Design a protein around this ligand. Structure first.
Ligand SMILES: NC(=O)c1ccc[n+]([C@@H]2O[C@H](COP(=O)([O-])OP(=O)(O)OC[C@H]3O[C@@H](n4cnc5c(N)ncnc54)[C@H](OP(=O)(O)O)[C@@H]3O)[C@@H](O)[C@H]2O)c1
Ligand SMILES: Nc1ncnc2c1ncn2[C@@H]1O[C@H](COP(=O)(O)OP(=O)(O)O[C@@H]2O[C@H](CO)[C@@H](O)[C@H](O)[C@@H]2O)[C@@H](O)[C@H]1O
Length: 307
């Protein structure tokens, strides 16, 4: 069996789908369904069982066996960059991930987890997977950073696979529950379908991100499970594109709309990455040689799915 935490969430449900496509259905999903609308992310998929994140943690820490576990994809986390309860954040993200890591380590279970490009903080180049390039701008980012640092202390003596994926700006199907944390592409689609003006933050001209399609993210995850390589790896296209480019691809699909620029949100000031671009050197050197969908490709495919 395979365990996917955050499996009812965006990236996690996409990993579940990718597993299904390879004929794998013996899957335990661990998540938090408090927001019950997330069920749609699993409704068309095939899994073996569901467990709440709190029950899972209790059983993990008690040393319960879940069967013959082939791997844990740990996508489960508080994913909100605007959540400032750091007690909860360090607990639900950092500490939770440590407990799971040690559980897998004791049993030689491959452990593939979610990092974040938020760890890089404010930066105009050299998004490289090393401590000197890392300086997160929020506590979410810190929770991710500190766990990556913890993993680095553990790697040299791990006897089983440990892989962290430093996701950049992931977008695509199954993120409709994320609200304000959903991709700009999703927000633009929603706005256009509601007869509202599509909205970008003021200054978005000069804002760029490495937007990466969730389908590719899932593919990378499965490739690493198949190939057994350990480490911490950037996961993006390696190309930075403006939010305008995402808007252009979205408006082109809808064949209507005019971007309205809104005030830059106050709670994001001093907390915002104006630029990201994955350096894929280490990812390629690991053996992952597949191309990534561009914004034009991915967003167009995404809009077709959404509509
Ligand atoms: N999507 C992106 O652009 C992006 C970029 C970089 C990194 N990431 C990371 O990738 C992972 C998945 O992101 P996502 O976009 O899929 O977000 P998501 O849709 O919110 O998926 C996370 C899911 O996990 C649940 N959860 C929270 N803590 C958990 C835990 N300890 N164990 C199991 N489940 C838990 C969440 O519920 P509750 O929060 O309500 O408890 C939510 O349903 C996260 O670690 C996120 O930080 C995502
Ligand atoms: N330029 C522009 N225009 C309109 N809306 C924008 C925008 N930039 C960002 N947004 C919206 O605000 C949400 C939060 O901004 P960020 O703090 O920069 O969050 P991210 O863009 O990095 O997206 C988050 O990434 C982390 C991974 O690090 C995930 O865990 C989160 O779930 C988010 O996906 C944006 O979501 C956007 O809607």
């Amino acid at each position: 069996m395979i365990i996917v935490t955050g499996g009812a969430g965006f990236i996690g449900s996409n990993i579940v789908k990718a597993l299904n496509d390879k004929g794998i259905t013996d899957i335990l999903v661990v998540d938090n369904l408090k927001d019950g609308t997330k069920f749609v992310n699993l409704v068309d998929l095939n899994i073996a069982d569901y467990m709440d994140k709190e029950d899972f943690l209790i059983q993990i820490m008690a040393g319960e066996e879940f069967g013959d576990v082939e791997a844990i994809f740990h996508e489960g986390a508080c994913s909100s960059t605007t959540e400032w309860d750091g007690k909860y954040m360090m607990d639900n993200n950092y500490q939770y991930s440590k407990e799971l890591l040690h559980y897998c380590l004791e049993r030689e279970i491959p452990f593939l987890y979610a990092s974040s490009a938020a760890t890089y903080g404010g930066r105009t180049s050299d998004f490289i997977e090393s401590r000197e390039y890392e300086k997160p701008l929020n506590v979410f980012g810190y929770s991710k950073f500190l766990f990556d640092e913890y993993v680095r202390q553990i790697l040299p003596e791990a006897n089983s696979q440990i892989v962290g994926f430093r996701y950049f700006n992931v977008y695509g199907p199954r993120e409709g529950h994320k609200g304000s944390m959903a991709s700009v592409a999703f927000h633009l689609n929603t706005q256009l379908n509601n007869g509202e003006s599509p909205k970008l933050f003021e200054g978005s001209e000069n804002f760029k991100r490495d937007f990466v399609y969730v389908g590719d993210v899932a593919d990378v995850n499965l490739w690493f499970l198949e190939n057994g390589v350990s480490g911490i790896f950037n996961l993006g296209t390696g190309r930075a594109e403006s939010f305008q480019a995402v808007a252009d691809a979205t408006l082109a699909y809808h064949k209507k709309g005019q971007i309205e620029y809104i005030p830059f949100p106050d709670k994001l000031k001093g907390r915002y990455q104006a630029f990201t671009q994955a350096d894929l050197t280490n990812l390629r050197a690991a053996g992952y040689d597949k191309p990534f969908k561009t914004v034009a490709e991915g967003v167009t495919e995404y809009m077709a799915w959404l509509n």
